[PDB]
Tab-separated table of C-alpha atoms and ligand atoms in Angstrom:
chain	number	residue	atom	x	y	z
A	1	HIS	CA	-1.795	7.351	-18.289
A	2	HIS	CA	1.616	6.664	-19.968
A	3	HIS	CA	3.673	5.641	-16.814
A	4	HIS	CA	3.802	1.854	-17.585
A	5	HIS	CA	7.458	2.000	-18.907
A	6	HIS	CA	8.641	2.984	-15.322
A	7	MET	CA	7.388	-0.440	-14.072
A	8	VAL	CA	9.481	-1.853	-11.182
A	9	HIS	CA	9.343	-5.448	-9.791
A	10	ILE	CA	8.279	-5.068	-6.146
A	11	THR	CA	8.708	-7.865	-3.562
A	12	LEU	CA	7.466	-7.877	0.044
A	13	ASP	CA	9.893	-7.720	3.023
A	14	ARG	CA	8.848	-10.533	5.495
A	15	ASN	CA	10.850	-8.914	8.319
A	16	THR	CA	8.563	-5.803	8.306
A	17	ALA	CA	5.300	-7.778	8.260
A	18	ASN	CA	2.830	-7.847	11.131
A	19	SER	CA	3.164	-11.307	12.754
A	20	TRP	CA	-0.314	-12.447	11.500
A	21	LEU	CA	0.509	-11.908	7.780
A	22	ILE	CA	1.222	-14.750	5.340
A	23	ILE	CA	3.514	-13.756	2.441
A	24	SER	CA	3.714	-16.132	-0.549
A	25	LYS	CA	6.958	-17.952	-1.525
A	26	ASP	CA	7.485	-15.540	-4.480
A	27	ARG	CA	7.064	-12.523	-2.044
A	28	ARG	CA	4.407	-11.095	-4.420
A	29	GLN	CA	1.195	-11.805	-2.396
A	30	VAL	CA	0.149	-11.160	1.215
A	31	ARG	CA	-2.975	-12.031	3.216
A	32	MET	CA	-4.232	-11.907	6.815
A	33	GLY	CA	-3.855	-15.224	8.651
A	34	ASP	CA	-6.427	-16.386	11.250
A	35	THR	CA	-3.630	-16.500	13.977
A	36	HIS	CA	-0.006	-15.498	14.833
A	37	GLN	CA	2.239	-16.979	12.089
A	38	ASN	CA	4.962	-18.276	14.499
A	39	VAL	CA	7.670	-15.667	13.707
A	40	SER	CA	9.954	-13.934	16.279
A	41	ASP	CA	9.287	-10.246	17.093
A	42	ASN	CA	11.680	-7.513	15.871
A	43	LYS	CA	11.798	-3.710	15.826
A	44	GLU	CA	10.809	-3.528	12.093
A	45	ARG	CA	7.384	-5.314	12.383
A	46	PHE	CA	4.213	-3.249	12.313
A	47	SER	CA	2.617	-4.241	15.684
A	48	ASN	CA	-0.926	-2.743	15.661
A	49	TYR	CA	-2.119	-3.143	12.023
A	50	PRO	CA	-1.852	-5.772	9.227
A	51	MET	CA	0.895	-3.802	7.394
A	52	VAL	CA	4.046	-4.775	5.457
A	53	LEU	CA	6.646	-2.885	3.340
A	54	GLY	CA	8.192	-3.641	-0.030
A	55	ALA	CA	11.917	-4.572	0.072
A	56	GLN	CA	12.823	-1.923	-2.534
A	57	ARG	CA	13.996	1.562	-1.421
A	58	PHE	CA	13.672	4.552	-3.785
A	59	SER	CA	15.634	7.835	-3.402
A	60	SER	CA	15.417	9.142	-7.056
A	61	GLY	CA	13.646	8.551	-10.386
A	62	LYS	CA	10.220	7.504	-11.552
A	63	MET	CA	8.656	4.200	-10.386
A	64	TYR	CA	5.337	2.455	-11.253
A	65	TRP	CA	3.705	-0.740	-9.932
A	66	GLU	CA	0.239	-2.340	-9.777
A	67	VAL	CA	-1.650	-4.091	-6.986
A	68	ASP	CA	-4.660	-6.434	-7.243
A	69	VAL	CA	-7.378	-5.698	-4.593
A	70	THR	CA	-10.127	-8.020	-5.983
A	71	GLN	CA	-12.880	-8.984	-3.429
A	72	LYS	CA	-11.419	-6.904	-0.564
A	73	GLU	CA	-13.582	-4.761	1.724
A	74	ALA	CA	-10.701	-2.793	3.330
A	75	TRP	CA	-7.022	-2.024	2.504
A	76	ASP	CA	-4.475	0.804	2.394
A	77	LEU	CA	-1.900	1.255	-0.441
A	78	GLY	CA	0.855	3.698	-1.323
A	79	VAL	CA	4.403	4.573	-0.219
A	80	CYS	CA	6.006	5.624	2.981
A	81	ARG	CA	9.320	6.813	4.394
A	82	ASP	CA	11.725	4.071	5.419
A	83	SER	CA	11.719	5.591	8.971
A	84	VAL	CA	7.924	5.530	9.679
A	85	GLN	CA	6.839	4.453	13.179
A	86	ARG	CA	6.246	0.654	13.426
A	87	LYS	CA	4.872	0.256	17.009
A	88	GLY	CA	1.637	1.535	18.556
A	89	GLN	CA	-1.184	3.614	17.086
A	90	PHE	CA	-0.732	6.237	14.350
A	91	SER	CA	-2.671	7.856	11.470
A	92	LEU	CA	-1.666	7.533	7.816
A	93	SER	CA	-0.736	11.096	6.803
A	94	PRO	CA	2.113	12.887	5.012
A	95	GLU	CA	3.094	14.454	8.388
A	96	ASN	CA	3.737	10.857	9.646
A	97	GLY	CA	5.587	9.857	6.418
A	98	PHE	CA	2.766	8.145	4.431
A	99	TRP	CA	1.301	8.858	0.951
A	100	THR	CA	-1.658	6.444	0.721
A	101	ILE	CA	-5.283	5.829	-0.342
A	102	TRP	CA	-7.699	3.328	1.169
A	103	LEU	CA	-11.013	1.511	0.957
A	104	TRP	CA	-13.086	1.418	4.168
A	105	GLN	CA	-16.865	0.861	4.662
A	106	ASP	CA	-17.748	1.135	0.991
A	107	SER	CA	-15.913	4.504	0.430
A	108	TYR	CA	-12.469	5.416	-0.941
A	109	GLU	CA	-10.358	8.153	0.722
A	110	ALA	CA	-6.878	9.682	0.371
A	111	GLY	CA	-4.704	9.687	3.513
A	112	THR	CA	-4.386	13.462	3.887
A	113	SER	CA	-4.959	15.054	7.338
A	114	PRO	CA	-7.868	15.238	7.516
A	115	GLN	CA	-8.711	12.545	4.903
A	116	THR	CA	-10.079	13.458	1.458
A	117	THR	CA	-13.099	11.830	-0.220
A	118	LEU	CA	-12.290	10.109	-3.540
A	119	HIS	CA	-14.787	9.979	-6.477
A	120	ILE	CA	-14.680	6.465	-8.020
A	121	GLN	CA	-17.587	5.373	-10.300
A	122	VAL	CA	-16.005	1.941	-11.194
A	123	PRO	CA	-14.745	0.113	-8.037
A	124	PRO	CA	-11.151	-0.866	-8.858
A	125	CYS	CA	-9.910	-4.457	-8.944
A	126	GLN	CA	-6.299	-3.263	-9.652
A	127	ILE	CA	-4.605	0.028	-8.560
A	128	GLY	CA	-1.569	1.612	-10.304
A	129	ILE	CA	0.882	3.633	-8.146
A	130	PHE	CA	3.284	6.156	-9.703
A	131	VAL	CA	6.090	7.936	-7.776
A	132	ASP	CA	8.162	10.787	-9.206
A	133	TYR	CA	10.809	11.340	-6.529
A	134	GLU	CA	12.311	14.547	-7.938
A	135	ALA	CA	8.932	16.164	-8.689
A	136	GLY	CA	7.488	15.217	-5.244
A	137	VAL	CA	4.444	13.380	-6.738
A	138	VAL	CA	2.553	10.200	-5.801
A	139	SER	CA	-0.375	9.314	-8.113
A	140	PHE	CA	-2.976	6.523	-8.055
A	141	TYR	CA	-4.747	5.087	-11.116
A	142	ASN	CA	-7.872	2.895	-11.586
A	143	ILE	CA	-6.618	0.071	-13.889
A	144	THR	CA	-10.196	-1.431	-14.073
A	145	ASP	CA	-11.426	1.952	-15.545
A	146	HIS	CA	-8.843	2.319	-18.392
A	147	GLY	CA	-6.229	3.865	-16.060
A	148	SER	CA	-8.329	6.858	-14.913
A	149	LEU	CA	-6.757	9.108	-12.222
A	150	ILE	CA	-7.876	8.465	-8.629
A	151	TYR	CA	-5.662	10.932	-6.685
A	152	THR	CA	-2.398	12.951	-6.895
A	153	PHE	CA	-0.352	14.013	-3.873
A	154	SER	CA	1.834	16.894	-5.097
A	155	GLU	CA	4.369	19.091	-3.243
A	156	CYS	CA	5.370	15.931	-1.355
A	157	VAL	CA	8.195	16.314	1.178
A	158	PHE	CA	9.480	12.680	1.202
A	159	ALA	CA	12.438	13.595	3.525
A	160	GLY	CA	14.027	10.134	3.158
A	161	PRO	CA	14.105	6.947	1.108
A	162	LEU	CA	10.626	5.603	0.143
A	163	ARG	CA	9.288	2.057	0.428
A	164	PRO	CA	6.142	0.522	-1.109
A	165	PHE	CA	3.462	0.333	1.636
A	166	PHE	CA	0.592	-2.205	2.055
A	167	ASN	CA	-2.204	-2.850	4.597
A	168	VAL	CA	-4.371	-5.956	3.927
A	169	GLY	CA	-6.892	-4.757	6.571
A	170	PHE	CA	-8.532	-6.647	9.424
A	171	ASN	CA	-11.015	-9.414	8.742
A	172	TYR	CA	-13.579	-8.928	11.563
A	173	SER	CA	-16.404	-9.309	8.975
A	174	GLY	CA	-15.262	-12.606	7.375
A	175	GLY	CA	-15.498	-10.768	4.007
A	176	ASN	CA	-11.916	-9.375	3.839
A	177	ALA	CA	-9.709	-12.525	3.716
A	178	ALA	CA	-8.594	-12.031	0.080
A	179	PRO	CA	-4.906	-11.154	-0.549
A	180	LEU	CA	-3.162	-8.094	-1.961
A	181	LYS	CA	-1.204	-9.289	-5.017
A	182	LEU	CA	1.567	-7.495	-6.943
A	183	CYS	CA	0.531	-7.818	-10.639
A	184	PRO	CA	2.991	-8.884	-13.342
A	185	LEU	CA	4.602	-6.333	-15.723
B	201	LIG	C1	-5.787	-20.047	1.557
B	201	LIG	C2	-6.985	-19.387	2.171
B	201	LIG	O1	-7.180	-19.452	3.382
B	201	LIG	N1	-7.827	-18.702	1.371
B	201	LIG	C3	-8.780	-17.728	1.897
B	201	LIG	C4	-8.477	-16.360	1.324
B	201	LIG	N2	-8.515	-16.409	-0.132
B	201	LIG	C5	-9.267	-15.566	-0.862
B	201	LIG	N3	-10.220	-14.886	-0.235
B	201	LIG	O2	-9.074	-15.433	-2.060
B	201	LIG	C6	-7.605	-17.406	-0.691
B	201	LIG	C7	-7.876	-18.771	-0.090
């Protein structure tokens, strides 16, 4: 792909994080802690899942960023509306304000409703995410496989400002402790 020149510097918003997440000093990495991280509760925190938002809000233009997923067994990545539900149980779908892909149990899927099987021959260590606000597009790229396309959501109805979206996943297995990292430009 040729989207690299739309690169944006994403940082994580601590206030939105599930209370078990540990965000690095530079706000560029996040991982699952083994306990509650001793923060107060607030209406922005994702309560049920190990999720956090980027601080940046996008309402126009073209944006690109990359995320390192090395080692991980489970994660979700993409964008979401600023007004997505934070509390209780919900599915990741465009109807609920999410445009995401994930890894779960050795398969990759796009967060459509119902979910869509992805076809990835080279398991990615870094994912590129491209948003074209005006066109209504969210695309995912396999940086490990020379930038090959993973998935395109088109005809998106964003219906609000967008925020970068992250889920580090649970670590029931002891094999999913590794962080998500925002990769340098
Ligand atoms: C600081 C710490 O607990 N860890 C465990 C998770 N890590 C990993 N899997 O890469 C980083 C080191």
